[PDB]
Amino acid sequence: VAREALVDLCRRRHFLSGTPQQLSTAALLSGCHARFGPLGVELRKNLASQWWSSMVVFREQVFAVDSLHQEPGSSQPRDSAFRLVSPESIREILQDREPSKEQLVAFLENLLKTSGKLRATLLHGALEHYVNCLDLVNRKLPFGLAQIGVCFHPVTRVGEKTEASLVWFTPTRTSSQWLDFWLRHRLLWWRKFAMSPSNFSSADCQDELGRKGSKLYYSFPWGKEPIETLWNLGDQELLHTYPGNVSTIQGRDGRKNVVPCVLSVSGDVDLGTLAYLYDSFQLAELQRKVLKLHPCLAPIKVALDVGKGPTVELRQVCQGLLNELLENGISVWPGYSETVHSSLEQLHSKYDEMSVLFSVLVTETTLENGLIQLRSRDTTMKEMMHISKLRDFLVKYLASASNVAAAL
Amino acid sequence: EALVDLCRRRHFLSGTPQQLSTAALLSGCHARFGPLGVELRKNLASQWWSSMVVFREQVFAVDSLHQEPGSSQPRDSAFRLVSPESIREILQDREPSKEQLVAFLENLLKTSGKLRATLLHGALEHYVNCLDLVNRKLPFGLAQIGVCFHPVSTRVGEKTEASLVWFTPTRTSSQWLDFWLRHRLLWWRKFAMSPSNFSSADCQDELGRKGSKLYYSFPWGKEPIETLWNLGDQELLHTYPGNVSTIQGRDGRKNVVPCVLSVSGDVDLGTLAYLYDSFQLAENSFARLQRKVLKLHPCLAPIKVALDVGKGPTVELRQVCQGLLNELLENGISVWPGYSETVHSSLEQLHSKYDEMSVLFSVLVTETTLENGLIQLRSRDTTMKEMMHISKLRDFLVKYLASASNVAAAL
Amino acid sequence: ALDVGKGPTVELRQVCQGLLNELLENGISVWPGYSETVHSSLEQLHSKYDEMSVLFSVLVTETTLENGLIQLRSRDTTMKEMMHISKLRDFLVKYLASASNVAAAL
Amino acid sequence: ALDVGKGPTVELRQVCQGLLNELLENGISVWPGYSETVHSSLEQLHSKYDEMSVLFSVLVTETTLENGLIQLRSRDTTMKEMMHISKLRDFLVKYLASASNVAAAL
DNA sequence: CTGGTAGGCGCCTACCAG
DNA sequence: CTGGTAGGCGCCTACCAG
DNA sequence: CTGGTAGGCGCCTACCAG
DNA sequence: CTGGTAGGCGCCTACCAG
Ligand code: NA
Ligand code: NA
């Protein structure tokens, strides 16, 4: 009942996309379809932008890495990674010449041995770029490699999920404290944008080899779902990536040459986007459906609309106002450009369901004294302010909101 | 080539020397870019999204999977996605026959999914959902930046594609295609040192559909970096078979089935183009001497400022750099923390490194800075040094990047 | 501003006339410093043009008669640069077109 | 002079507005006749521009929205010509430059 | 305050002959 | 086809209701 | 393993050369 | 100007007995 209204709202306002069968909980968690619509892409884009800011830009010695979605194939038993086969190579044996029974078995056997596979994590990409980045940092430990990309997980169907990975290379001497540092840092990052930060929790975990780690969860209406995993992998994966002389992969821990310990920090950006959508849905006031996404994450910051007055002159004021806001990094919904006229009540409900932070109305009064009508999403309050002050207000509001979360 | 050697030394590119050849870089069979190359491509994708989505009317974002539904097209060369468990279910469960093996390969060629080659179908499948968003008002567009997969003469290569699928009535289809062609070519040239190396040429497909391709003049010859097509309405009807009323748009007051325009650019090859375009053999002083310097456009240069310390108390100097680094980062200015490096470098060694890394400005904090607040500022393009108060550095950089972003908008 | 350096003054000033004519035909104001016959040092000449707000100073020398390279000096940066005399017109029209569009945004 | 013909006035005025901005940025004086709301026949409109000594009259029509062709009328010869709208800027700049170079030879 | 509406008059579409 | 008016069409103000 | 000094280690500033 | 360097003295490492 309540969970059905949110997905219906996100589908109506184009946060999500797909048929009703693809909008179920199990279908959204699998990731077997393009889950997000235009608003959902921009929200995830703002979520990935905030991740990159707090994990790369303002972090010391964290660098970017690019890796292919494909990894070299091998014959490890039960790898489950989908293999990449050329359709011409299959047609090159069924149409070129008449094959034999023994030749067909060798073709399927060579497929499991040589064909590439889709990546499941971004860990291997960072391990393969470790040596190249080691020269960049002058072999000074610690440092990290970060990347945001789509990974592939088996579900007969294939699922795609956007992973935000940070692979931290640290000495074993301080490996436990860096793992604890990132754990507290990642959990504060999820909670600073949340209306109910208590729904984001953490729990320790171990793998088969007893390596200690921790996972982050969000409390969905059906239960907790893991959104981020942190692992203390040690130095096992790094030695297998570079077999041979360890001197080529040894880092400098102050004055000691040590093979570094690898920390894997992997977060689900797609599932986190759904988490904030559930976190933002609240019924307030007479009840109203309003999504209160954090101002740094809300895809649309301001909406421009016209009221009573000369339509040509009013749209010219909106066009110039839209350009000034876009030139200052403020996303604008050009409601004035829509040919379908809407009432203020219908307009306020649409923008509240689209998580639009502020609604602006340009009227004939604006053409006389320059005053526009400003409506807040969170407080429903209307107020009159001069159009020349709108840019500074929105810029300072977004700057203030981004800095309140930093102190938390 | 001295540039590929330079880009590998400064971590614009990555890979062994065998995969750093021309044919290997064009195939895209390996992760080509290093940390600086990723940031350059990221700034190129940001500038693309700004001039193609943000400041364009009725252009919206679209997300699509890397997989497309499989079918039995004979001319389809896209790599297929096969479950490895289904392969072991026929080679290990029971002893198969020849008829069972052929039926397995035939069923996979008809049902197994395939990796996408373009972003066109992803926008076509989201056309109806976005048509309701615009209240059926034509024209509008769907844009997406993602990695596509291309077969290589078997190995498979990956290339980042910046796609814009424009839905417009056929009445104005030819003029919208000409509009985007001029807009894309001006976008490439505004960041280029030699804009004449970016050219355009008309082309046609198998069915005679008119289009245009953009090229960059690499040292070995022109290479296509962007393709524009006037596809008509063929792909849109095959995507939505049935009643055309569900896909009809509003051309002013007339309900018509829109014409599809595809604008796809190669982001990976475009970064290689700007790396070749930025390399020049300038001279810091002809009469005491050439220098290898990459003059990437300020909007594209991955590192805007570099911070280093000079003579003076190292503790106090690094505290000033840390506070200065935070102020620049908080204002969207990328900073290279050269002061945090433990290896000491001379100014000449430091100037050549920052020039090869295309760092726009080099700042040196010295004992003088602790006395009167003056830092040393060096320009990448002119190699000139200047004393400037540290309180004015942020304003100078944000206005320099603002000016640079405004001449390119006027060109 | 156009001036001559070391070399035969007759042939160097003839090159300056053709260069001045090409610049005037493209709307570029030129100070014919080469036509002045009084003795002047480079320090006095640079101080004169910098105080007259001359954007660029060009010097035609015996090198220009051999390979076509002239000496270009910037007012703002005092930086000297060697460029071919045939490319001077393109450099000036692009620099002046850029400055008008830098201030057009502000 | 810029004017609109048969077709959606709103769409045609947007094309004329963008064409006027490109011509003004290249030093070409434009008469924005498209901004007038009162109807005037082509005969009445051409007689006004001839009396105003307007060198060329341009007409943006529905055909311009389809293939980009505009109608160009010369003042001296009263001849109509169809040319692509992207070539109007290059044509006017060279025509004005040619007239100035022919008069310089007199 | 806000939306639904009726109607005068100028702007604009598109008739409709050559 | 093309271009001139005839005439349809939508903007804007004012009144009203809830 | 713990802690208090003994002793090494690196910062800082004058020279010197190119 | 700038880089290479030598050395006095306080900061810091890590000796080395309990
Ligand atoms: Na009509
Ligand atoms: Na010690």
GROMACS .gro file of C-alpha atoms in nm, chain C:
model
  106
  820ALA     CA    1   5.477   4.912  -3.327
  821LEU     CA    2   5.725   4.834  -3.606
  822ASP     CA    3   6.099   4.901  -3.574
  823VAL     CA    4   6.422   4.785  -3.736
  824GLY     CA    5   6.723   4.627  -3.567
  825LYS     CA    6   7.073   4.535  -3.678
  826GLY     CA    7   7.110   4.523  -4.055
  827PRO     CA    8   7.079   4.739  -4.367
  828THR     CA    9   6.821   5.003  -4.281
  829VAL     CA   10   6.711   5.054  -4.643
  830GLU     CA   11   6.599   4.695  -4.704
  831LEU     CA   12   6.461   4.656  -4.350
  832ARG     CA   13   6.239   4.965  -4.373
  833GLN     CA   14   6.103   4.846  -4.708
  834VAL     CA   15   5.991   4.524  -4.538
  835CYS     CA   16   5.822   4.734  -4.268
  836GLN     CA   17   5.621   4.932  -4.525
  837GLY     CA   18   5.472   4.616  -4.674
  838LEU     CA   19   5.404   4.480  -4.326
  839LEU     CA   20   5.245   4.807  -4.212
  840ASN     CA   21   5.022   4.810  -4.520
  841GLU     CA   22   4.905   4.454  -4.452
  842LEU     CA   23   4.822   4.544  -4.091
  843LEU     CA   24   4.637   4.865  -4.180
  844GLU     CA   25   4.429   4.673  -4.436
  845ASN     CA   26   4.306   4.451  -4.148
  846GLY     CA   27   4.209   4.733  -3.912
  847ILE     CA   28   4.524   4.713  -3.697
  848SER     CA   29   4.669   5.047  -3.589
  849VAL     CA   30   5.047   5.062  -3.634
  850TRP     CA   31   5.310   5.300  -3.499
  851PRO     CA   32   5.577   5.342  -3.773
  852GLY     CA   33   5.876   5.352  -3.540
  853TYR     CA   34   6.102   5.237  -3.823
  854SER     CA   35   6.045   5.568  -4.004
  855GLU     CA   36   6.205   5.759  -3.715
  856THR     CA   37   6.571   5.842  -3.779
  857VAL     CA   38   6.680   5.947  -3.428
  858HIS     CA   39   6.904   5.718  -3.224
  859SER     CA   40   6.717   5.504  -2.973
  860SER     CA   41   6.813   5.211  -2.752
  861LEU     CA   42   6.595   4.906  -2.694
  862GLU     CA   43   6.548   5.010  -2.331
  863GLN     CA   44   6.436   5.358  -2.435
  864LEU     CA   45   6.221   5.209  -2.712
  865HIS     CA   46   6.056   4.954  -2.482
  866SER     CA   47   5.990   5.220  -2.217
  867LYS     CA   48   5.839   5.446  -2.484
  868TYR     CA   49   5.597   5.184  -2.618
  869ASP     CA   50   5.502   5.055  -2.273
  870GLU     CA   51   5.419   5.411  -2.165
  871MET     CA   52   5.222   5.455  -2.490
  872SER     CA   53   5.025   5.136  -2.410
  873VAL     CA   54   5.140   4.967  -2.732
  874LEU     CA   55   5.018   4.608  -2.711
  875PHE     CA   56   5.295   4.447  -2.918
  876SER     CA   57   5.638   4.555  -3.041
  877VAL     CA   58   5.780   4.401  -3.359
  878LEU     CA   59   6.146   4.418  -3.463
  879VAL     CA   60   6.264   4.351  -3.820
  880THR     CA   61   6.629   4.242  -3.830
  881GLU     CA   62   6.876   4.085  -4.072
  882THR     CA   63   6.734   3.750  -3.960
  883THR     CA   64   6.406   3.842  -4.131
  884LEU     CA   65   6.591   3.883  -4.461
  885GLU     CA   66   6.736   3.530  -4.422
  886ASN     CA   67   6.447   3.315  -4.292
  887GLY     CA   68   6.158   3.559  -4.238
  888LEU     CA   69   6.157   3.554  -3.857
  889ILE     CA   70   6.067   3.870  -3.666
  890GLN     CA   71   6.092   3.948  -3.294
  891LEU     CA   72   5.760   4.002  -3.113
  892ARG     CA   73   5.750   4.158  -2.766
  893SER     CA   74   5.443   4.162  -2.542
  894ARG     CA   75   5.355   4.471  -2.341
  895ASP     CA   76   5.193   4.286  -2.050
  896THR     CA   77   5.457   4.015  -2.008
  897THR     CA   78   5.776   4.165  -2.162
  898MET     CA   79   5.815   3.824  -2.329
  899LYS     CA   80   6.002   3.814  -2.659
  900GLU     CA   81   5.898   3.555  -2.916
  901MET     CA   82   6.029   3.468  -3.262
  902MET     CA   83   5.760   3.409  -3.524
  903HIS     CA   84   5.747   3.414  -3.902
  904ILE     CA   85   5.653   3.752  -4.046
  905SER     CA   86   5.378   3.592  -4.258
  906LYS     CA   87   5.195   3.474  -3.943
  907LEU     CA   88   5.196   3.813  -3.766
  908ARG     CA   89   4.868   3.928  -3.922
  909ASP     CA   90   4.684   3.610  -3.820
  910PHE     CA   91   4.821   3.635  -3.465
  911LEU     CA   92   4.712   3.996  -3.421
  912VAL     CA   93   4.361   3.961  -3.566
  913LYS     CA   94   4.301   3.654  -3.347
  914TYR     CA   95   4.440   3.819  -3.033
  915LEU     CA   96   4.228   4.132  -3.084
  916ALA     CA   97   3.919   3.924  -3.166
  917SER     CA   98   3.978   3.724  -2.847
  918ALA     CA   99   4.010   4.034  -2.627
  919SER     CA  100   3.682   4.181  -2.754
  920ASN     CA  101   3.502   3.855  -2.672
  921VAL     CA  102   3.668   3.817  -2.330
  922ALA     CA  103   3.525   4.155  -2.229
  923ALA     CA  104   3.195   4.085  -2.407
  924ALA     CA  105   3.103   3.825  -2.143
  925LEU     CA  106   3.169   4.062  -1.850
   0.00000   0.00000   0.00000
